[PDB]
């Protein structure tokens, strides 16, 4: 059982927004389907749910005349359609499958809704740099909406890497990476700070250079 | 509109030792068919809820023999004979009997290992940060446990409360510990008007600070 969630991004208050799921891996016309969503506070909320043929449809009070919800059988396929978006409406949104005894038995990776009026900014990416350990970092600085990803050496160092989350403020997020190499490897050998942040289409790798 | 609660909000635990969930409905939960449809979910940092439990006490396919579901009525509990660091995270309780549904609002479950002193580092901006008219100056707070940590800034000697921010991770599984990210934010012009720069970290691994410091030379 496979679920995969897209469409979400950025839209402005009373916009409109369509969300994918596609499944696979089972009889999708035979289980009902549900969307839940969690918000920054990381409560999660049940939006709707759709039996197997499409007839029945139970949803959230307050996403009535706003929300739609349907499924393409032949084609493997749940949708929801946003319209009229409030800030309260922004979060990641999750599709899943239901299963006899149980509600949100198998759930997908999710996809990020943001609602709201900043203007989408790439990120600026800048070095961090300054025992046997030595701690480097990146910082990812005014950019907007989430995510953004990072990794060190093009994901050849994942053992003693961490990312923080990011802080909102002023409509820009920035957020910081730090990773821990022997001092011996550097700068002899590279460290280099890979940033990608989808919703500008925008690549960034950054060396780290000794001051 | 039915409601659910959940206690503790966070819950401290060592490796092996036991822990207890509870969740209370506002009323009951039992379906016109029968059923008590209270599941278990657990969200582990970093990735999508996970289904433990259904039907207030059946543990779904895959899912160790430690994990117990029981209660009855309006009042449930989520049981684990003997806690592995995986298991930690954000477990919520879920009805599914009447419309709308609902979930509790989650209960941190907290792995307790040997305290840990943070490993400091700080970072004077980058001459590309400069360039542009900026200078954010970065201290990261490196594994440490416990979670609570006091950071402060000095510049030349003294406090600055104003443009601070700061951002704690989860806590890791791997060990099991926490790190903090504390940022100060300045001009080029207000960062070129000091010298020292230092930020302090408070901790109960020790009575005095850890201070990390440098000159802008």
């Known amino acids: 059982v496979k679920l995969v969630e897209s469409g979400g991004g950025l839209v402005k208050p009373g916009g409109s927004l369509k969300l994918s799921c596609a499944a696979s891996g089972f009889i999708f016309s035979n289980y009902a389907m549900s969307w839940v969503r969690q918000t920054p506070e990381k409560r999660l909320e049940w939006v709707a749910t759709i039996s197997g043929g499409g007839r029945n449809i139970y949803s959230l009070d307050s996403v009535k005349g706003r929300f739609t919800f349907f499924r393409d059988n032949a084609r493997n396929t749940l949708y929801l359609q946003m319209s009229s978006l409030r800030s309260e409406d922004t979060a990641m949104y999750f599709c899943s499958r239901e299963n006899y005894g149980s509600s949100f038995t198998y759930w997908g990776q999710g996809t990020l809704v943001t609602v709201s009026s900043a203007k989408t900014t790439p990120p600026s990416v800048y070095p961090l740099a300054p025992n046997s350990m030595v701690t480097l970092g990146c910082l990812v600085k005014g950019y907007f909406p989430e995510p953004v990803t990072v990794t060190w050496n093009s994901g050849s160092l994942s053992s003693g890497v961490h990312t923080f989350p990011a802080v909102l403020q002023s409509d820009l997020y920035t957020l910081s990476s730090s990773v821990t190499v022997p001092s011996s490897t550097w700068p002899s050998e590279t460290v280099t700070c890979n940033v990608a942040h989808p919703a500008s289409s925008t690549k960034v790798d950054k060396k780290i250079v000794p001051r | 509109d039915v409601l659910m609660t959940q206690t503790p909000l966070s819950l401290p635990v060592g490796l092996g030792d036991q822990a207890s969930i509870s969740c209370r409905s506002s009323?009951?939960?039992?379906?016109?068919?029968?059923?008590?449809?209270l599941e278990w979910y657990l969200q582990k940092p970093g990735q999508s809820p996970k289904l433990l439990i259904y039907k207030v006490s059946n543990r779904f396919s895959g899912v160790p023999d430690r994990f117990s579901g029981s209660g009855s009525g309006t009042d449930f509990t989520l049981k684990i004979s003997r806690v592995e660091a995986e298991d930690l995270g954000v477990y919520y309780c879920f009805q599914g009997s009447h419309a709308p549904y609902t979930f509790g609002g989650g209960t941190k479950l907290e792995i307790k290992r040997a305290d840990a002193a943070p490993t400091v580092s700080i970072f004077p901006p980058s001459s590309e940060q400069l360039t542009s008219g900026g200078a954010s100056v970065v201290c990261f707070l490196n594994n440490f446990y416990p979670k609570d940590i006091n950071v402060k800034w000095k510049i030349d000697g003294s406090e600055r409360q104003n443009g601070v921010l700061n951002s704690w991770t989860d806590q890791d599984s791997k060990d099991s510990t926490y790190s903090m990210s504390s940022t100060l934010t300045l001009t080029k012009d207000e960062y070129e008007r000091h010298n020292s720069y230092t930020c302090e970290a408070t901790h109960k691994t020790s009575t005095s600070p850890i201070v990390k410091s440098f000159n802008r030379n």
């Open positions: 009323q009951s939960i039992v379906h016109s068919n029968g059923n008590t449809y």
